[PDB]
Amino acid sequence: VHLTPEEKSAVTALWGKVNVDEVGGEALGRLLVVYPWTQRFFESFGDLSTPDAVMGNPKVKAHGKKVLGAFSDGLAHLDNLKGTFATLSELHCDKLHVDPENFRLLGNVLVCVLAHHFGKEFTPPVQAAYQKVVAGVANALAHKYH
Amino acid sequence: VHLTPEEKSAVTALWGKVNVDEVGGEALGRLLVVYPWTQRFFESFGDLSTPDAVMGNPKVKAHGKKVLGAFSDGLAHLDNLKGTFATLSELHCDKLHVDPENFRLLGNVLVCVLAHHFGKEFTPPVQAAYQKVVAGVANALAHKYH
Amino acid sequence: VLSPADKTNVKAAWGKVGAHAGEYGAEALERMFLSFPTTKTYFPHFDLSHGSAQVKGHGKKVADALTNAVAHVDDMPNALSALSDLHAHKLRVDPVNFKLLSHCLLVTLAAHLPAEFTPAVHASLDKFLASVSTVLTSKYR
Amino acid sequence: VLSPADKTNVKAAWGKVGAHAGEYGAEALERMFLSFPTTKTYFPHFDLSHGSAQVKGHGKKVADALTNAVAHVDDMPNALSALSDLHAHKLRVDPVNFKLLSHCLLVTLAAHLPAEFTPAVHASLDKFLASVSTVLTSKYR
Ligand code: HEM
Ligand code: HEM
Ligand code: HEM
Ligand code: HEM
């Protein structure tokens, strides 16, 4: 991921303020509500029929934290996204059968969530850096597909 | 790009049989007919009001040959598409103002034309290797955009 | 929107496909799984090896739904209502994949009907397949 | 299609934007140009530096067009008819770019409407901007 040092410092700066638990839940929940077809992977999560059902589902919330924990771990290895996510790539491909376009949608929803939480602090330049990061993470997760 | 040796040799073998004059003219003209908005870059070529006009257009044909000539020279440098097309990327961004999404369209059109020309010989495996090349070229042409 | 000329172009082109529709659907699918391996995520239950029977059988179904569309070109939403429901509420295929199958159908047609795949015809078929895709993703949300 | 609840959500959110529309349009454009630089190729005649007067002026026009679409939510194809012809025949912006601007508009609204930008509303707005983009793109070929 071609990220300038100032891009990289902006990302890490903001990320230190993130409550990953809560942000992971909001991002995954919003994915399922705005793009309802993504619900096809989570039928074992129970009730996903309305917005409150999705957003407050404890299983969505717990899974959200698992996703963002892995994402965080990625921000600590920005120069080697592909190796960091290799096993997660294989798994999403060979076992879970998830179309990688889903990783792109999630990235964009995460960007909306950050903007939602941080307001003016999510400046255009900071957004532009995060857009590179989410694309890099999506490309890394897609890389082992075959 | 990540091209398999059998993939590399499939591409090369087929390209040895391509009539660049015919194929170049056909690819560029079809782009202009199938996606009429791409005509915005070629106002100075003349009449483009109809397919026959576009396909008959001598500037279109001449320019199509030049494009495939450049493409032709990229296939001899498949391990360094980026360096090979750097100045061309710069020119397409800084002087011509061409949205790179157009590079993807030309690519898919190119594949359709190779199919039309070679029929049976353009098998699913040969197609797959050519889709990789075409994306590679598009990506290399977009790389110096800023 | 499909123009009168597009409709004529597609009808003509599809007409020549005739009894080969089945084989061409299968071929387009194979071309799709190979060129764009992400599309295989939607068929983990299929044997996807070359010439398998699931793909052959599935090719026919796809090709037949397209024949139906051509015949009902002026009333696509109604003719394809059930398939739209299927793709939107059960299968839930990401919309981006429709473009990939469409291209592969175009390449299959270009490979089999050299005389008929003129530029105007190429343009009409691309519009037609796009129109079909819009309808099929129309009820997603 | 937009549902009754979608329409309600969109009028409510946009209503809260109010007299901030122009400003949010300008910021949406800045966000797009910086996050997706390829979009700059359509504006080589503009000064694109921060605070640019041209960006500000164009932001206002984008925003006014959206305000109109909201005012005529039950007749958008006709209300945006002129804009759709302009984009299709004069400007010829590749369709993929509409998704980028739409995403940047949502990011802008989220950043400025913390209480109203609920999941249900986020969903409605996304559907709305996608219907706007569809109209603007409907006459391309
Ligand atoms: C930022 C991108 C993503 C990351 C980092 C991520 C990470 C993870 C992790 C760490 C797991 C648990 C692995 C395990 O159980 O062994 C997981 C599971 C899973 N992921 Fe992802 N994920 C991402 C995006 C997605 C999206 C977009 C989808 C589908 C829309 C998805 C589908 C699934 C499914 C269905 C599971 C298993 C759920 C279960 O336990 O039943 N993932 N993901
Ligand atoms: C396969 C991808 C492409 C390649 C390899 C390519 C290559 C070239 C080359 C070699 C030239 C000649 C430059 C010179 O005279 O020094 C050129 C010119 C040009 N290209 Fe491309 N091109 C590609 C795709 C496109 C597409 C998709 C468009 C827009 C639809 C485009 C727009 C132009 C324009 C407007 C010119 C200037 C032609 C003129 O002299 O009037 N190119 N390109
Ligand atoms: C040109 C657009 C398409 C058409 C006309 C089409 C048509 C059909 C038809 C006729 C069926 C059979 C339903 C039945 O058994 O009655 C079907 C099912 C199915 N389609 Fe599509 N399809 C299209 C695109 C897609 C693409 C883009 C995908 C995803 C890559 C996809 C994935 C599936 C799957 C997974 C099934 C179920 C297959 C099975 O389990 O037997 N379709 N489609
Ligand atoms: C939300 C969807 C969009 C809407 C509502 C919209 C609206 C408008 C409006 C009202 C105008 C002014 C025309 C006039 O002066 O009467 C305009 C012009 C223009 N738009 Fe769009 N637009 C949209 C998306 C885009 C996209 C995605 C692009 C390209 C990335 C684009 C590029 C342009 C350009 C280049 C002009 C002419 C600017 C000038 O030369 O002054 N628009 N648009």
mmCIF file of C-alpha atoms and ligand atoms in Angstrom, chain B residues 28 31-32 37-42 44-45 63 66-71 85 88 91-92 96 98-107 110 134 137-138 141, ligand 2:
data_model
loop_
_atom_site.group_PDB
_atom_site.id
_atom_site.type_symbol
_atom_site.label_atom_id
_atom_site.label_comp_id
_atom_site.label_asym_id
_atom_site.label_seq_id
_atom_site.Cartn_x
_atom_site.Cartn_y
_atom_site.Cartn_z
ATOM 1 C CA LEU B 28 -11.039 1.211 -31.413
ATOM 2 C CA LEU B 31 -15.241 0.991 -28.390
ATOM 3 C CA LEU B 32 -16.639 4.170 -30.006
ATOM 4 C CA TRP B 37 -19.443 8.441 -24.640
ATOM 5 C CA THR B 38 -15.825 7.567 -25.439
ATOM 6 C CA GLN B 39 -16.219 9.647 -28.615
ATOM 7 C CA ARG B 40 -15.619 12.719 -26.475
ATOM 8 C CA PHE B 41 -11.860 12.224 -26.933
ATOM 9 C CA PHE B 42 -11.928 11.962 -30.692
ATOM 10 C CA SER B 44 -11.344 15.899 -34.333
ATOM 11 C CA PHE B 45 -11.482 12.565 -36.182
ATOM 12 C CA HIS B 63 -5.080 5.431 -34.513
ATOM 13 C CA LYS B 66 -0.932 2.729 -33.120
ATOM 14 C CA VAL B 67 -2.746 1.608 -29.973
ATOM 15 C CA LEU B 68 -2.205 -2.100 -30.692
ATOM 16 C CA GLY B 69 1.397 -1.319 -31.608
ATOM 17 C CA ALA B 70 1.834 0.005 -28.109
ATOM 18 C CA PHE B 71 -0.028 -3.030 -26.772
ATOM 19 C CA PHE B 85 3.757 2.375 -20.026
ATOM 20 C CA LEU B 88 2.020 6.862 -21.838
ATOM 21 C CA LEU B 91 0.401 11.532 -21.264
ATOM 22 C CA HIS B 92 -3.076 10.019 -20.864
ATOM 23 C CA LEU B 96 -5.254 14.005 -22.598
ATOM 24 C CA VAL B 98 -8.660 10.377 -20.129
ATOM 25 C CA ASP B 99 -10.564 8.574 -17.319
ATOM 26 C CA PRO B 100 -8.772 5.200 -16.871
ATOM 27 C CA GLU B 101 -12.011 3.444 -16.587
ATOM 28 C CA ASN B 102 -11.946 3.776 -20.409
ATOM 29 C CA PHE B 103 -8.837 1.550 -20.479
ATOM 30 C CA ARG B 104 -10.948 -1.303 -19.056
ATOM 31 C CA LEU B 105 -13.606 -0.852 -21.645
ATOM 32 C CA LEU B 106 -11.064 -0.922 -24.490
ATOM 33 C CA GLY B 107 -9.640 -4.105 -22.924
ATOM 34 C CA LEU B 110 -10.235 -6.066 -27.422
ATOM 35 C CA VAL B 134 -5.766 -6.603 -20.479
ATOM 36 C CA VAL B 137 -2.259 -3.047 -19.199
ATOM 37 C CA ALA B 138 -5.161 -0.996 -17.941
ATOM 38 C CA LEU B 141 -1.771 2.899 -17.892
HETATM 39 C C1 HEM E 2 -4.868 -0.194 -24.651
HETATM 40 C C2 HEM E 2 -4.917 0.968 -23.976
HETATM 41 C C3 HEM E 2 -4.359 2.211 -24.688
HETATM 42 C C4 HEM E 2 -3.120 2.353 -25.157
HETATM 43 C C5 HEM E 2 -1.987 1.304 -25.113
HETATM 44 C C6 HEM E 2 -3.012 3.656 -25.769
HETATM 45 C C7 HEM E 2 -1.896 4.177 -26.374
HETATM 46 C C8 HEM E 2 -1.856 5.363 -27.047
HETATM 47 C C9 HEM E 2 -0.778 5.840 -27.902
HETATM 48 C C10 HEM E 2 0.515 5.080 -28.246
HETATM 49 C C11 HEM E 2 -1.094 7.036 -28.356
HETATM 50 C C12 HEM E 2 -0.248 7.928 -29.310
HETATM 51 C C13 HEM E 2 0.416 9.022 -28.476
HETATM 52 C C14 HEM E 2 1.371 9.843 -29.307
HETATM 53 O O1 HEM E 2 0.997 10.287 -30.427
HETATM 54 O O2 HEM E 2 2.523 10.050 -28.840
HETATM 55 C C15 HEM E 2 -2.378 7.368 -27.767
HETATM 56 C C16 HEM E 2 -3.047 8.526 -27.982
HETATM 57 C C17 HEM E 2 -4.288 8.836 -27.510
HETATM 58 N N1 HEM E 2 -5.078 8.046 -26.690
HETATM 59 FE FE1 HEM E 2 -4.630 6.205 -26.070
HETATM 60 N N2 HEM E 2 -4.212 4.292 -25.608
HETATM 61 C C18 HEM E 2 -5.070 3.437 -24.955
HETATM 62 C C19 HEM E 2 -6.384 3.692 -24.653
HETATM 63 C C20 HEM E 2 -7.049 4.866 -24.820
HETATM 64 C C21 HEM E 2 -8.450 5.087 -24.620
HETATM 65 C C22 HEM E 2 -9.441 4.078 -24.021
HETATM 66 C C23 HEM E 2 -8.684 6.370 -24.852
HETATM 67 C C24 HEM E 2 -10.012 7.124 -24.709
HETATM 68 C C25 HEM E 2 -11.148 6.554 -25.056
HETATM 69 C C26 HEM E 2 -7.474 6.967 -25.302
HETATM 70 C C27 HEM E 2 -7.338 8.267 -25.693
HETATM 71 C C28 HEM E 2 -6.280 8.708 -26.434
HETATM 72 C C29 HEM E 2 -6.271 9.979 -27.086
HETATM 73 C C30 HEM E 2 -7.375 11.045 -27.084
HETATM 74 C C31 HEM E 2 -4.951 10.069 -27.805
HETATM 75 C C32 HEM E 2 -4.428 11.222 -28.679
HETATM 76 C C33 HEM E 2 -4.708 10.818 -30.127
HETATM 77 C C34 HEM E 2 -4.468 11.982 -31.051
HETATM 78 O O3 HEM E 2 -3.288 12.220 -31.385
HETATM 79 O O4 HEM E 2 -5.460 12.662 -31.426
HETATM 80 N N3 HEM E 2 -6.490 6.026 -25.273
HETATM 81 N N4 HEM E 2 -2.825 6.326 -26.978
#
